[PDB]
């Protein structure tokens, strides 16, 4: 029993479990559809926005639960825990919804089973970012990432020492290193006949960060189109 192998397997396992108990998998969800503006794109469907932002709010709550289960995350300062959650929220939301993409129906499925087509995702609030998110979800599907890879990638995005205004960036940097090592060993075990899958999977975060930056701009334009405030937790995360 080599020590770091033992520790990394322990880490890998509790991150897969953390992701699984805070994000149902697509095959576990009873899908249902809605006919709200599902045939033509509109500036916004307020009823879809309501349902979608409610489901997003509930998933952010699960993302906080996921983080509290990452080793060392609650050893960070309170302000750093807050700063990291706000900076990675959209990253992890994007990654989660892309694991819920069904290519033949061209749909995404929320954690209550709601299954929206591309037009409805647009009308719910994706707006101009819709095709970018859907294109990203098609590029991930061939990789066929399981819960371990999605959990580890989410943890890597969250525990990131380069976020602005951390108080202990070095402590966060160090906390990320076993996550990167665990992902690399796991990919090599799972995709033996595939040479450079660790860099390929890892640099998918590059896409996440790009999309998530654009989603921050979208929040600004959305506020002008919604006749009301966004859910307060979304307000807090998007500051």
């Amino acid at each position: 029993s080599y020590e770091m192998t033992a520790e990394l397997d322990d880490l890998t396992e509790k991150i897969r479990k953390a992701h699984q108990e805070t994000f149902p998998s697509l095959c576990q969800l009873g899908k249902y559809t809605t006919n709200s503006s599902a045939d033509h794109r509109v500036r916004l469907d307020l009823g879809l926005w309501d349902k979608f932002s409610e489901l997003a709010t509930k998933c952010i709550i699960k993302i906080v639960e996921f983080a509290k289960r990452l080793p060392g995350f609650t050893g960070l300062t309170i302000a750093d825990q807050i700063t990291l959650l706000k900076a990675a929220c959209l990253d992890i939301l994007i990654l989660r919804i892309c694991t819920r993409y069904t290519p033949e129906q061209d749909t995404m499925t929320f954690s209550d089973g709601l299954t929206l087509n591309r037009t409805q995702m647009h009308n719910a609030g994706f707006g101009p970012l819709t095709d970018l998110v859907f294109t990203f979800a098609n590029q991930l599907l061939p990789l066929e990432m399981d819960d371990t890879e999605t959990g580890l990638l989410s943890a890597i995005c969250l525990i990131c020492g380069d976020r602005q205004d951390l108080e202990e960036p070095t402590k966060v940097d160090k906390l990320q290193e076993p996550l990167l090592e665990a992902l690399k060993i796991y990919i090599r075990k799972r995709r033996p006949s595939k040479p450079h899958m660790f860099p390929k999977i890892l640099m998918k975060i590059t896409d996440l960060r790009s999309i998530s930056a654009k989603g921050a701009e979208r929040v600004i334009t959305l506020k002008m189109e919604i006749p009301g405030s966004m859910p307060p937790l979304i307000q807090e995360m998007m500051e």
Partner: peptide, 11 residues
């Protein structure tokens, strides 16, 4: 400031 995230963390 918003209170939700801090209450969720303390949860």
């Amino acid at each position: 400031r918003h209170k939700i995230l801090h209450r969720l963390l303390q949860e």
